[PDB]
């Protein structure tokens, strides 16, 4: 079962994005990571729009195989694995390039 977290933020929304896929979390290190794709990610959360997408692990580095790559949101999908992108786990990068978001938690939903 998917599922998405924003993890060592000061709160449920705000962090480093991490999705669960097969089993085991995985973080995005999208080299785009545009407010479109984090608007994405705050909708899914119920954590209201998109402040920032914080870039280069600025939440620090996650760990263990990387799970998206470039993934390029239209901005109004319901969740961040339904927009396009190039693929799971098949990426080179690392994870000093770490994908984050602050949302702006306003969400009461
Ligand atoms: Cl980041
Ligand atoms: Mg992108």
Redesign the pocket.
Known sequence: GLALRLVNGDGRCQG?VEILYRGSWGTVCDDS?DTNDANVVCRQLGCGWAMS???????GQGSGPIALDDVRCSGHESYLWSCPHNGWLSHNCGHGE???VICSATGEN
């Open positions: 480093r990571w997408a914080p870039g280069n692990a600025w939440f770490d994908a984050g």
